[PDB]
Design a protein around this ligand. Sequence first.
Ligand code: ICS
Ligand code: CLF
Ligand code: CLF
Ligand SMILES: [Fe+3]
Ligand SMILES: [Fe+3]
Lengths: 480, 475, 522, 519
Amino acid sequence: MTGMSRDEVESLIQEVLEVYPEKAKKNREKHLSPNDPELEQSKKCITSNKKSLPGVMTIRGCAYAGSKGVVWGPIKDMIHISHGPVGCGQYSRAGRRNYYIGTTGVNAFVTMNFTSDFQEKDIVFGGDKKLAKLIDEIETLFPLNKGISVQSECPIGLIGDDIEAVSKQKGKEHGKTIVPVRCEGFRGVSQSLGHHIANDAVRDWVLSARDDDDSFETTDYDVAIIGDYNIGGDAWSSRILLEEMGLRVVAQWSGDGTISEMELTPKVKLNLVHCYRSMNYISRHMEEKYGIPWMEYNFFGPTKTIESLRKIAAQFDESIQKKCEEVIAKYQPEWEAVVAKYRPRLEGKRVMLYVGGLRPRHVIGAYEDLGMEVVGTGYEFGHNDDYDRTLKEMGDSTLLYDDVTGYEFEEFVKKVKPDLIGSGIKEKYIFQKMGIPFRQMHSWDYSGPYHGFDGFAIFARDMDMTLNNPCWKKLQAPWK
Amino acid sequence: RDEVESLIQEVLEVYPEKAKKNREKHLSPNDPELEQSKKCITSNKKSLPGVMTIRGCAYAGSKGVVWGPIKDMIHISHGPVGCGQYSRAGRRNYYIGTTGVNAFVTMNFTSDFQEKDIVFGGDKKLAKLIDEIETLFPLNKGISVQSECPIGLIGDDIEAVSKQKGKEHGKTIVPVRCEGFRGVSQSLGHHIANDAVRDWVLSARDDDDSFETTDYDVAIIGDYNIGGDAWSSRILLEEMGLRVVAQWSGDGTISEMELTPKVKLNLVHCYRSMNYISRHMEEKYGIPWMEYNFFGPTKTIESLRKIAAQFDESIQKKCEEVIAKYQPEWEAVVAKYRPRLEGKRVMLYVGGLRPRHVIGAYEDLGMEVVGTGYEFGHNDDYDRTLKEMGDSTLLYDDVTGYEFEEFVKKVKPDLIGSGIKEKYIFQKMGIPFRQMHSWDYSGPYHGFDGFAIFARDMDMTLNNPCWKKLQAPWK
Amino acid sequence: SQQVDNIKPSYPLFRDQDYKDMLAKKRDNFEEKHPQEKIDEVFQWTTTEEYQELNFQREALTVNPAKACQPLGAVLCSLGFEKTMPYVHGSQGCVAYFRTYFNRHFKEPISCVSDSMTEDAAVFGGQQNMKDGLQNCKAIYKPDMIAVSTTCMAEVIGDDLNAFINNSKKEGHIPDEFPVPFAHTPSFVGSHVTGWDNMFEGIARYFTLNYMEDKEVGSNGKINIVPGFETYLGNFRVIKRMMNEMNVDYTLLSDPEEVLDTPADGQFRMYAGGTTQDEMKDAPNALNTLMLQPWQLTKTTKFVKNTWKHEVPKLNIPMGLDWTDEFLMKVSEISGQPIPESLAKERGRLVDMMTDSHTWLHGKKFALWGDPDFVMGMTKFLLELGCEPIHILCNNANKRWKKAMDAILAESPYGANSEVHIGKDLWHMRSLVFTNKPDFMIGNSYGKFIQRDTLYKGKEFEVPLIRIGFPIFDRHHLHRQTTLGYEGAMQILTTLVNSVLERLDEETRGMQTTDYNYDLVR
Amino acid sequence: VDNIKPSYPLFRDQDYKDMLAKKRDNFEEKHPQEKIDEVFQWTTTEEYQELNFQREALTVNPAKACQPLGAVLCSLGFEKTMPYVHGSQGCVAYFRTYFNRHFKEPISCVSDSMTEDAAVFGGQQNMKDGLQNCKAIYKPDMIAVSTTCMAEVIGDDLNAFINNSKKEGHIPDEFPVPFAHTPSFVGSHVTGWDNMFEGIARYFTLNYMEDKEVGSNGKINIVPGFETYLGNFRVIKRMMNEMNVDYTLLSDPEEVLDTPADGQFRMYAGGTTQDEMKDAPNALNTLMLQPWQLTKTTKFVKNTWKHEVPKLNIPMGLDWTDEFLMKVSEISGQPIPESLAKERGRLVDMMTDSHTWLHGKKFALWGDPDFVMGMTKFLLELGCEPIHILCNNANKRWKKAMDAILAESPYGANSEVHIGKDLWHMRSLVFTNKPDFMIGNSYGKFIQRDTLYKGKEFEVPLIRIGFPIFDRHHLHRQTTLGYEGAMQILTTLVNSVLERLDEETRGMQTTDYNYDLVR
Ligand code: ICS
Ligand code: CLF
Ligand code: CLF
Ligand SMILES: [Fe+3]
Ligand SMILES: [Fe+3]
């Protein structure tokens, strides 16, 4: 059966827009569009990075979620303070699956919830004195921490607190790096501004720590993995491929990352950016200051992984390129066996995706390696450049939805009728009630990794396990 | 006390005339001044049909009690599947070993009799079964064939199979005719099992003096290591300077039993189950045997001194060292728990030894046994109980389910110590219950270390908050 | 030594150094134990495929059977009738074992009497024991009905239960009108579930066989339900609850849930609830009879079809999703009562939990054993969950049952790697879980020794036991659970998925080694 | 293939172990393992605990959430009601995700997406647009408005904003929009539930008390509070039904948190009707299931509805379920049926059957004030010793009541109540004064990991009772209230002891003695 024509997709877009009030409908009309592969600039088809409409069930988080939850929190040897009331740190505690190796509570603190637990006295009279005392208690009770970050929640920027002054004074007093991050949840429109604020915090407080330090020995094959957060060990599956290629991964952040790795990044020869959306800010800064080239790579599925490995190897000498062909040949039987086993059970299946800023386009090649077709995709907080990259990677006349609402995503699913949906935890149980197989594209449904060749076997097993699960054939009662 | 006799009369009126006349012989007040219990109570008789008797069978007394605890031997429940299944790992006779390799206590080896085995006999099946045991469990050190009820009824010949297979495999195979119908209780199972020990195992090293012997060699007889009871007793004996060569049968081995005729003294804890083998060893090897009681500090101290008096002064000196060493431990236990248990009244009903052996331990906590009885104790068992129990105190032999409940409803004890089949009956009635067979999966209770557990367990159950909450507040 | 504030039971007490030194001396001096190297070598041998071949070649030796004998099932069936005393004609040692067995599983008083046949009855018969036992049992415990089964001794000597009970009534030991149903329950035939089937058929034919003249099918507008050997109280409760939800008039014959769950309120109730004699007498007047466990109820099914003329449906055990659907639709068809929206909602909630937990259960390998109908229902539900039951064992199933199980597995892609074993014990199961390791075992408490063995080979070889079935001795109040219906499927599903999650947490608790993947969210 | 390994077994392969070792040794600049071990050993000592309990500014691993989360749960308890959190959208994403992971269910809740613009001019325009959009899109019968901390800090007037929305036509004047200020820097999530319920009750009844008569509808109001066990809502309904007591469960989210999967998504299901809330002052009385977290609601009901609101404990355990049933019987005049006496007797029978394995067992527990108080009371009834009682939310009044409860029992002599302490405080407590088990939410799993790391003999297993439960499935369906809840708690506790004992005695030839078949 042929995919939905362009005319049918626009007609569907119009129907979902009817129930909106006129002001809301005018806004939402710009965020839904059929895919035009022939289009070079997505500004002329879809609009992104705007304010969420009030009173709609948006999936977006906040700048604190994008800074504390995404960029700073995975740094394992640093303690991250959820500065403010208890709620923000509690809901984001160990909710992301940024994998790390360490002794939690001693030298690693990722799954920990350090918070200032603001009361009304701290709201009324400020929390700068409380923050200063809190940092002292951190030094006493967690002496092996290698750094402190102050992640501001909403009231910090509203009551006029000065965390830069406290961080500067306490960092000098304790000889420690203290990073004040003004990632108040109201500052932007999504987690996307949290990435920019966190990246600027990295630039202003960490990245320059070794500018006059040359003790670290450097090789011509030094690389840093930027914007891989090791979701279920994603960065570990990517790192093993890069080092099998003969490269030395000096830094990887934030997943399993350390503060010292972040400070060693200005010494690498190439910056491999997996998530452009969250870390293109620091990559451009490092190119402009240290002259380090940065390139985007995709390790989702064998086809993208092989293309990325060859493209990375082309940035080095022939010895690295020779080792690249050795790695590709070594893993070729592994992923071919995965395809031979699982492609027959997934060929022709249609999937609709909705993830935050990278995965709506990065995982498409992995699905196409399994014979599946992505009939719809969208971003929570992807920018125009994110949608520019999606246009060519996405089929013609395919539904695109920016900042999709709870109502819109449900109505789109009811008409498109995908065999599988990949989205967040807030949409998982809505579509499972409707009888459509669901895979979490954020936490990997607590499976994974999905990166690299080893991750592709897990990805194909997981897609097959959910899509072909017997539970989906029993949604209707036999007497009904 | 006329009142206790009046209670006995009232519970008796329910029975038909024939059943009643039989039951009056088995209930009587305790007369400490009486020397022979035959003149007050009758025991070791047949159970009345149609009553909820607590007794087991000869198979339970032989396979379950005497032979099963021997860890390095495989014990076949010869017959249908039932008997071995219900007795599998049900007694808590503790052992050390690799189960399935060199130890087999909690295992259920059975011939699983079908109709063809009942109709055409199971001697060929038994012979084939022993071959399979040799193949699949080559580290076993011996085999016992515990006959279930059909074995003695279909005319099987397990002695001939055991003899031939034992010679063929160079193994000790002990045929035990412990068919459950043979006696009136587990008591005959003890005698049959003891005779099987004598006829097949005990004389194995009669012409073998290679084992080195000392003047302080002892064997513990009739301690089945319930929750480690024999281990708690053994540590006291060896701290006294004695060498425990064997223990029967808890944690026991076939070689330990074969080494028993080489000891200087046989310490019998359960007289009822193992007095047969003790008398035989005294008449054949000249080994003296004496009864000892390690229940509670008072009995333990008395037994340790009595045992030490059978040896030289060096052992007696070490006995006073052991008693002094453990004196602070049990005194602290008494100081902690006697205030919580003083004056409480206990009714006991266990098998052939514990109805009288645990009384001193209760009296060490200030408690009083206001009634006791045996499932299968003999007249000599009740002779021993007469002086260990207070005057005008209820005694019940082979008590029925109805009688034991009626006695409890009148006597109203603060605690009942009995088996699992009555544990949940008296918990409904709101009376704290302690299992005196499995120790309620606690223990050990023997020795000084076991007394701390015993006092903790009595306190935990008797003073539990649950007993004050059986009545609904609105009722 | 014992500290008064740190009193140690056996396990921590004998791990003290003084007890360790004692045990080491005892082993090295008197036990004549095989050297530990030889013991280790033999244990390693018993976990191999070569040992499994020898293990499965045996035909005379049974090691750790997963089954009991017939009179145990007869006692449970008798306990399901109002004020009925289970009466086992034969040796008293059997009754002591039956009561103790049920005592340890239900943690409840179990009423059952023996007539204490001895060596005298081995040659003269148990007629005198029957006359005295029936008279004594009626006089002492005052039952409304005495259900007579047999021990193997009475069966071997060929005692005639019918003649013995008739002679008891003729000679005045019991009234002629007193109901004394009987069933021959030979322990060398079948298993405990066979005894339940024989006992129920004996009680059913006692009350209805000679009174079929005035009976009319469907005249009382009810549906009979025969549960069979059932040791989960929630299974009796879920069936009654579902029938009440559908407003379907029903008669649960052999209903023991009340007497197996009496309250502790200062009184002992020997009898509680149970199927009344009027219910049994009026049973032929029902619209139909449903066998909850048809594989263990063949003799009852033959009697009900041939005597009551009830067209007993070919219903599977109502376990899992599909078979609970079939049971509910069959009940709806017979009674004419629609399936209520509440049951559709309950089914949908079970489906929702299946959807929520499917990622953690897909591909999980299970070795299971138990009674034929429970095993078949467990296997069916496991296939519905995407699990692979790779070792399906039933010590007490026939070749017809194995044929049906193979057809069930052939219908599912998740049964391709499945093998059904009949007439095999738990020593066979121990070999199976070593050579072809499942992720989990589903079975009774005897599987705990298999887990100990697999752990001894190594932590990565340990196969954890999930306690579902009979008997459960080392856990408390699991007999209150449910395995039937959507509620039973939910309880099984919750137990299975959380067994996976608890096992995964144990494997990922190691700090700095496996503490990655020690996820807060699963 | 045939052995596809997820993360845990995959990264234990030697090639991944070698990679991680090289990464740690060359770039991570990690502290030496000897220093790490020394510091960890230090964090388990009494000296560390004293420093741990001396902090006044740093909270580490709290055992509480913020007010709007409780307000959302309360709003979900009303029929076709959309939880609406006036403030920043990041809070709602966290609230929904938090409840998604615990209930494994869809959670409906909207934000009006207040941003930096509203930080200066206020969130009035967000309220007007948000209420109009929420009503038009999701078509609720009622919109319950709470606040994020941003809206509270800038002092947004919920009443004025909602009134202006109705005056300017963004929503109909008659459309019910109850509101509650739920500042996250005050109290905890249970405080937000209390504030939200008081706001909804005040919205529907405060200006309509003239025609109300106490007891005129012959019912009893039940206010559950913040409750995340579906069986707790079910057990209260079931017990009232078998007593034939007419009742009104206000804020009943049972149906919407347990919708079936049948090919259709239900955003709304069940819930307390607006007529039920309107008629609530006409009830005979109102019962607070969790009185410690319902103080504002209790004050409103006593002073506005003129209901007596008896001093009832949470219906947990045996004694307090007895008191709840007898109080219901007294108010309604309905006798307690024999079925409930039988259920109580069965719970007592299980208490008797399991008392030997539970007596003397030491527990560290945490959670919400009423659940913790009920758990402590039931543990004392079971002969258990709760040695570390922790509650991050509770006040000094609650601690006083808990001390009185412990003083009433000999099993509370070795008990200490901690208020305002987090789970890092709990970690020190279980190290220095080790309990046999901890009863708590999923965050306790990290405490078990720490105690296992010190040693197997130091590991304190976690029994998952409370909120949130994230690493187990469908535990939210179980019950902690009534005799049924006490039976489930008892079964979990005794089998936790038995499972732990089996683990300790599984070692062949070392501890396989005492690996008893029968327990
Ligand atoms: S052997 Fe006997 S019934 Fe002496 S059959 Fe029985 S482990 Fe009892 S009173 Mo269970 S004559 Fe031993 C006994 Fe006593 S099994 Fe144990 S407790 S001291
Ligand atoms: S008195 Fe004793 S326990 Fe009874 S049979 Fe006889 S030896 Fe055995 Fe066995 S299989 Fe079942 S339990 Fe019996 S009916 Fe036969
Ligand atoms: S948008 Fe983001 S998550 Fe929201 S508050 Fe702001 S930084 Fe934080 Fe925090 S305590 Fe609770 S969850 Fe909020 S109401 Fe405040
Ligand atoms: Fe019970
Ligand atoms: Fe769900």
